[PDB]
Structure 1
Amino acid sequence: SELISGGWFREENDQWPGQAMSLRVEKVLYDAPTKFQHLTIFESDPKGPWGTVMALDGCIQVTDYDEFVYHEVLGHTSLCSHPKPERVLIIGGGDGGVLREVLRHGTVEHCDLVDIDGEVMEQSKQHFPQISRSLADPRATVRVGDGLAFVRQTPDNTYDVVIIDTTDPASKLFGEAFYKDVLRILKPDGICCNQGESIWLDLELIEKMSRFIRETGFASVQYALMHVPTYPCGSIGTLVCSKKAGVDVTKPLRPVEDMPFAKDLKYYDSEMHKASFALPRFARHINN
């Protein structure tokens, strides 16, 4: 209804009062609500480098150009922090981008993925094949359904890593029970990766979320910063949490340089891993 070839997409979001970013639309590939949210896929200006762009609820999620940053940082920062990650769970991750990166690791014997929106997955399968290729991997069991119901019915010490690639669709509505479930389904040496907000637009939420996950029972939580151009302020982050008291996730436990796919990565390496946990002074208290 809104987008039109030759017109411009506009990301507004009320998180930021009085700010907006826009991209010129070449061709609309999809624009409509789903069962759970508003999906919008389109081809951007060929003169520009962003390529095919996807927006969920009026917020750009994936673009061909910078897509690798968020997927590598979540996938590898958490897995490289675990001594031997054999079994992995991803809550969300419908486009398959984080799954693609987890599946690079030879140690991963199986990975479960649970996202609620099946139509987003289908549109990723069509317009982002390079991202969604891994949904069909023999080591991946992809499920469409409720992540809360899944983790509650999962027995204890099942997973080595749990990646939460979602902000819910400030532990509000379902955090208390869910993060307790996440803690118990992790093995004693378990690592939990959670997508964080920007240190520019919602530092207050990062502080609350960090304190909440520590109160839940995690022995440590550390915020990793990253350069993502398409995000409103240009820097989202992620909370990498340990169940085991003692482990320091800010230095890679298994450095990616010692495995054969290190040179295929566009963003992440061991030096970026270390660098991501150095926060500006104004935001430094998050990591103590």
Structure 2
Amino acid sequence: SELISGGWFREENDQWPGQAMSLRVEKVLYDAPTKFQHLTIFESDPKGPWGTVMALDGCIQVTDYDEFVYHEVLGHTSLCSHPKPERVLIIGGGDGGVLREVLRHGTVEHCDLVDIDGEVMEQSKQHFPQISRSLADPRATVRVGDGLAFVRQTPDNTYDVVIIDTTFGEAFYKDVLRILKPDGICCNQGESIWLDLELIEKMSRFIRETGFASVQYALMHVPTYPCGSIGTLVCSKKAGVDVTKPLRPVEDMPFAKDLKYYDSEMHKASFALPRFARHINN
């Protein structure tokens, strides 16, 4: 009801006030409130590199340009930290990007994807076909529902990996821990080390107190995020496992040469944090 072709999309929020990042709108493809959140999709300036942009509640979540960074990091940092990931769960990820990356792994026999907003996937199918192609994969079962409810009703020792593609109390992470198998790996999108370092520390310790043996924060270069860097918490249920070094190097996989960001050297480097934030990983 607002965004007009030729106008400018303006991203801005609290926690980080007195700052704004704006993108020119070439064409508004979708702009309306869904049952759960406000979904905005528009074509960015053709002379710029971003292409099609998706925003949720005013926050950019997907762009054609840097899309691969976040999806490869979440998908591969987690699965390459697992001895043999066969059954995988994705909470959120309706766009299908993380799913696409998880499906590259031949070890994966099945992946369950549970996103609460069915309109996110519908609009992703229409305006991000190269990302959402994964949603129709035989090895994928896509559910439209709450992930909190899903994990609570999932039996013990079901999944090898749980990827939480959504920025969720203690009952939820207790559920994530219990639904994972003994060598299970949990993955969540973490906050920025710049605009909310304090919440990362809290989330990191809270996840460990829930029962997970270890948690490590991985950093990534994603240009569309306010400070140009989001991260991801890679947690481990099993004790005595170092997720900072690739358990199975992706170079041994055939799809290794198809990735645009991730490789074993990026994996290692992602867990190297600036001195001011180093204490998170110790």
TM-score (norm 1): 0.97
**Residue by residue, what CA displacement relative to the aligned partner does 1:180-224 show, whole Å, maximum 9, x if unpaired?**
000000000000001101000000000000000000000000000
How far apart in 2 are the matches of 1:142 and 1:6? 36
**Equivalents in 2 of 1:229, 1:146: separation in Å?**
29
Q: What are the ranges of 5 or more consecutive residues in structure 1 without an aligned counterpart?
A: 168-173
Following the alignment from structure 1 to structure 2, what is the Cα–Cα distance between the partners of residues 110 and 7? 43
The CA distance in 2 between the partners of 1:270 and 1:177, in whole Å, is 34
Matches of 1:228 and 1:45, distance apart in 2:
19
SS at match of 1:261: helix
Partner Cα distance (1:55, 1:20) in 2: 15
The range that moved more, 221-230 or 14-23, is 14-23
Q: Does 1:252 align with 2:233?
A: no
Q: Which residue matches 2:50?
A: 50
Q: Deviations 1:68-113 (Å, cap 9, x if unpaired)?
A: 0000000000000000000000000110000000000000000001
Name the CA distance, whole Å, in 1 between partners of 2:260 and 2:72. 8
Q: For 2:83, what is the secondary structure of its paired residue?
A: coil
Q: Distance in 1 between matches of 2:149 and 2:33?
A: 24
Deviation at 1:229? 0.2
Q: Provide the C-alpha distance between the structure 1 equivalents of 2:15 and 2:135, rounded to a whole number of angstroms.
A: 32
In the alignment, the residues of structure 1 paired with residue 172 and residue 164 of structure 2 have an alpha-carbon distance, to the nearest angstrom, of 11
- Give the Cα–Cα distance (whole angstroms) in 1 for the partners of residues 63 and 2 of structure 2: 19
**Aligned partners of 1:41 and 1:151: how far apart in 2?**
30
> Does the residue aligned with 1:40 lie in a helix, a strand or coil?
strand
Task: Work out whether 1:28 is the aligned partner of 2:22.
Answer: no
1:49 Cα deviation after fit: 0.5
1:31-59 alpha-carbon deviations (Å, 9 max, x no partner): 11000001000000000000000000000
Separation of aligned partners in 1, 2:237 and 2:245 = 16
1-structure distance, mates of 2:43, 2:37: 20
Distance 2:268 2:216 in 1: 12
Spell out, residue by residue over 1:104-123, the C-alpha distance to the aligned partner (whole angstroms, 9 max, x if none).
Answer: 00000000010100001100
How far, CA to CA, are the matches of 2:204 and 2:90 in structure 1?
19
**1 CA distance for matches of 2:48 and 2:55?**
17
| Gapped regions of structure 2 (runs ≥ 5) | none
Counterpart CA distance in 1 for 2:71 and 2:186 is: 15
RMSD across aligned C-alpha pairs, in angstroms? 0.6
1:22, 1:270 → 2: CA distance?
34
Partners of 1:211 and 1:262 in 2: CA distance: 33
Task: Report the identity percentage.
Answer: 100
1:265 shift after superposition: 0.2
SS at match of 1:125: helix
Provide the rounded CA distance (Å) in 2 between the counterparts of 1:98 and 1:34.
22
TM-score, normalized by length of structure 2?
0.99
| Shift, 1:2, TM fit | 2.3
| 2: CA distance, partners of 1:49 / 1:124 | 19
CA distance in 1: counterparts of 2:229 and 2:252, whole angstroms: 28
Q: What secondary structure does 2:254 align onto?
A: coil
How far residue 4 of structure 1 moved from its aligned partner, in angstroms, is 1.2
Indicate the SS of the match to 1:141: strand
The secondary structure found in structure 2 opposite 1:120 is helix
Shift of 1:28: 0.3
Deviation at 1:13, TM superposition (A): 1.3
Task: For residues 222-274 of structure 1, give each alpha carbon's deviation from its aligned partner in whole angstroms, at most 9, with x where no partner exists.
Answer: 00000000000000000000000000000000000001000000000000000
What are the superposed Cα offsets for residues 116-164 of structure 1, whole Å, 9 maximum, x if unpaired? 0000110000000000000000000000011111111111111000000
Match in the other structure for 1:205? 199
SS in structure 2 at match of 1:41:
strand
Deviation, structure 1 residue 3: 1.4
Distance 1:3 1:119 in 2: 18
CA distance in 2, matches of 1:241, 1:12: 31
In structure 2, how many angstroms separate the alpha carbons of the residues matched to 1:261 and 1:270? Answer: 13
1:15 Cα deviation from its structure 2 partner: 2.5
| Structure 1 equivalent of residue 96 of structure 2 | 96
SS at match of 1:6: coil
* Residue 185 of structure 1: aligned partner: 179
The equivalent position to 1:282 in structure 2, one of 273, 276, 282, is: 276
Counting matched residue pairs gives 282
